[PDB]
Design a protein around this nucleic acid. Sequence first.
RNA 1: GCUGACUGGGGCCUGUAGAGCACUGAUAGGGCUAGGGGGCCCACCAGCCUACCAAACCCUGUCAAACUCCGAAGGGUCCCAGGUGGAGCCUGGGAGUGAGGGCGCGAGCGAUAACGUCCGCGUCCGAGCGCGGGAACAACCGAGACCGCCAGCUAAGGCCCCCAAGUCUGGGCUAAGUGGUAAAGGAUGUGGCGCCGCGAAGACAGCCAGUCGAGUGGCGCCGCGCCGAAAAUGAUCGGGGCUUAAGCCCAGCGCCGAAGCUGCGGGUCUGG
RNA 2: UCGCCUCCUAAAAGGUAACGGAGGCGCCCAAAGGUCCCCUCAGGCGGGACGGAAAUCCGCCGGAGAGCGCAAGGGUAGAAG
RNA 3: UCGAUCAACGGAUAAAAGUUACCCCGGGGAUAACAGGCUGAUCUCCCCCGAGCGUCCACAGCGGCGGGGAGGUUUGGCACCUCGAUGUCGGCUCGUCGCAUCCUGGGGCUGAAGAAGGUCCCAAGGGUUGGGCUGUUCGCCCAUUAAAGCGGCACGCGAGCU
RNA 4: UCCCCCGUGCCCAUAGCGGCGUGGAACCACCCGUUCCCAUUCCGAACACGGAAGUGAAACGCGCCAGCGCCGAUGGUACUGGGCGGGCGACCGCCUGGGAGAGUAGGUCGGUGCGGGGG
Lengths: 176, 84, 141, 59
Amino acid sequence: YRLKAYYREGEKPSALRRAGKLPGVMYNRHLNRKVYVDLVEFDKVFRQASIHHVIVLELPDGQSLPTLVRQVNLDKRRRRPEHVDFFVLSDEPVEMYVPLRFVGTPAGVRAGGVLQEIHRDILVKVSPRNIPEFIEVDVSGLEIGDSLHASDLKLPPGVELAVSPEETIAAVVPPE
Amino acid sequence: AHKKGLGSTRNGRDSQAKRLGVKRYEGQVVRAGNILVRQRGTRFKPGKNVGMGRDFTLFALVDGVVEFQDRGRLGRYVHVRPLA
Amino acid sequence: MLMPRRMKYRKQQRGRLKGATKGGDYVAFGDYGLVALEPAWITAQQIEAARVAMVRHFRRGGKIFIRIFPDKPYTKKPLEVRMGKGKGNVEGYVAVVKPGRVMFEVAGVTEEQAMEALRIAGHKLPIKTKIVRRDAYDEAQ
Amino acid sequence: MPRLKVKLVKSPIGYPKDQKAALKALGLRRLQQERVLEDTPAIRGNVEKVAHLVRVEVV
RNA sequence: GCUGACUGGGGCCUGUAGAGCACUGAUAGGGCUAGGGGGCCCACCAGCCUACCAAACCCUGUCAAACUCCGAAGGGUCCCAGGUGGAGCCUGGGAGUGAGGGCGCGAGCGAUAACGUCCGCGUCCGAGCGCGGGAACAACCGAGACCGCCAGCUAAGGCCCCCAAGUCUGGGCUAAGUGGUAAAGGAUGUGGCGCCGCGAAGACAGCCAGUCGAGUGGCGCCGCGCCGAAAAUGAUCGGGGCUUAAGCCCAGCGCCGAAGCUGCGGGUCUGG
RNA sequence: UCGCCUCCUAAAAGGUAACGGAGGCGCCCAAAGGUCCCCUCAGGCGGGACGGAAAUCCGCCGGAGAGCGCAAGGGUAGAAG
RNA sequence: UCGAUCAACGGAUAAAAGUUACCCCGGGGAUAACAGGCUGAUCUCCCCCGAGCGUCCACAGCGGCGGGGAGGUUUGGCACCUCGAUGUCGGCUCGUCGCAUCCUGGGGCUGAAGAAGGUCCCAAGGGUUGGGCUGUUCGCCCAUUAAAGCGGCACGCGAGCU
RNA sequence: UCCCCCGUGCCCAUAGCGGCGUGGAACCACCCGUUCCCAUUCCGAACACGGAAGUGAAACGCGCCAGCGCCGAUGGUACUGGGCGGGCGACCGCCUGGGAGAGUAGGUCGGUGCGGGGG
């Protein structure tokens, strides 16, 4: 996951947008810089990476910064990204979301019901040098009655549950 | 020519407007008496050389110059720093 | 039919429709949206009609999420009457909708059924609609 | 100060009072009228107000 | 007798636009869950369950003129500068008006109807039905008409003929006379950008699949056009007539064009 | 419907119309007044003979949602209670 | 210092209700009824969506909930010319126009065997009757008919009549 | 000038909640009393007076901690002074000045004035 970034000086964002570029910024306790990326290339990436997976930004001085996304502001009308926030990581432990694996399908089928991925992902504290790929769930006996919430998870090394942990994650519910 | 029939409202009132508000601002010279604020509470609390009437009205106690002051949780004070 | 249970006030002023949606603009629940492309007042009868068509299509099937709610009252003087004599009587209720509002949403369904269902609903609505997916609509960290 | 030469080139008929007044302050009174003025901010301040009625030029 | 409008800098005052849900209410989906309904089931009163009604609490989503944890642009005001203006302030004589109208913006009423109606800020007509544009047309565009000229430069808007000035240049679209005034919605109408399927594991379409030997399909952005389009005296874009335009979009040069501006003479009023 | 008060409409000074939205007034208090000195609310969760789901009692938690004769708004416990 | 629902609350007298189609004057298109106009809610027509109807089968014939338009003949909304006058229903007489077509001419679908329908498409050239009832418009009815269309023209037409 | 406590102002939650450690020599409290002054709708609880055995348990002071609370950029948007455009309308768009609110990074378990007592 790599993206050619560029350095934004003070060119009206409008004009950059107009020209298929995507204005933005990068920051961390230490650096703060106006940047821009190209749209279609960023989307190609973000469409998978998103906020779950690191992106490496290639600036015009050859340097390659390891970053996470923290924000995608978008124009309600013409639902497109107006501006991207990039957080450049280092080594201090940083909070983020990590995707889940909804294995199989739930047993609530006779009453017409349908699964609700209330949490596709969960908030966790992690070091930048111990970032997991995913987390593994266990859905099978999720009937029209019962559900699951809290620290019912397979937490690997480097991970710290930064949620309640008492909070609903996926519930099967009646049809429309 | 068949005229439709209509009702009434039970609504059409408001009171006389009462011209509330600050009457002199920071850095207006004032004589003793000059009322400085017409208000419905302690929206401003009286400061140095500022009295307040039965109706919450703040007023200069001396011939001076007005200073305002926000003290957060203590509220807002109007003072008259005197010239002499 | 679809209205609040209480209101602070019974009648209220018409007002206006500045652009944008403010919020309710990204997906959030189901896996396919029906989005607004124009401002409008949408009436409860329309919402309902669309909703019913959705279900009727994937009969009793998946799930539906109605994301606009008619809180605004809709006045109208009696028929044939002249002007004045106070505001009119309340006839129904509307939901104020502005471009980029995700009005509906669906889950537990094939793209084929979904695509179609929504289209259908878009017909019952007195505005232009678009269909949506689940892109960078994941305002997280 | 690099003084200003401003010239009225569009009619203020239809425009707001303050703008018509602003022209007086300066002392533009006919169209095509040209005046050189000091470059002080009080003068500028008015000239910005009417920017759209005027050709502005430095001296 | 320089204090005016307006402007610059400083200082107060403010609760709208926007936004927000901390209060007041409204509200979607989920979890948890006081009561209540109701099934299990008994009066020893407990007890278990509920793809039912339903407080608070939690997660995720919203709404509000009479909600606000928040809050611009602006607005009001005082000080100090500029500002000699058919500015200001003061005292007195004479009035007319006290019936408004349109347009733009911001609200209410109305049906997000009306050459509707009611306020607010602005502007013009009124009194500028004097002048140029708009075919014609109080108030849309231009522009404030003391008088004269067989002089000149511009404004809006224009430069194929009526009709002054380009059948001007360079690049595209469009084939409907669209332009020459209508919507949901329909379409293998056109053109331009995008990104994927998947092609000597040689069926995309055609006759037994071999031959056939290549391009095939699917979305997504954008421009122009087509149908959707029926009313009553004779039609028509102002008219003739316009098709690599005399249409439309993008560039540029020159010209035409008012009672605007200049030139030249004259008049009058103010101040010097 | 006709005077007076509160709120909104009212476009962040003031002011602002309509047979626009929606409520109050035509009283009251000899203490519900002056001053001095004290005192601090509503709720919520326990716990306690008669005792409801708030009678009175105890303990925690509770900056204000209580209260301030009466409509609304403003204000207010560092009191106006 | 007192006597006011002088509350129509800046308070005409201390003291006051009706009617006029028997009516008069002065004014107003400042303000209603007729007509036109703007508007098109209502109204007439047509379209989009495709839950379902139709033994089977979304459209032969149909279309729930909803959606978008046209026309300007209804009832209205507004109050713009007209109150120093724009005669204001219907009838007759005379017409002329529109097509959203009631006959007649073409035509495609059909749940079209034939015959006869249904439905939509093209098409006003020409036609579109005589009576009973009501002032009627319209309507119902009688007997016919190829048919017995619907509208506009100031609800066409009173310096043409009634 | 440097500590620590005792008073007393200012800044106005970055001062707070909650946790955790400390401090009694001096201050301060809690404490010992209820004769006396003074008190309780009943209570020496509170207020008040006379004290000094005991404790820092409570309260107060000082440290650490970010779970909650509080503060919070930059960038980009919204909105808009003023200038101008499209649409039949709801409304949309371009210029030039101003520029949020939410949110991201991040920060915070206070700072300071005067006077006193103690090294």
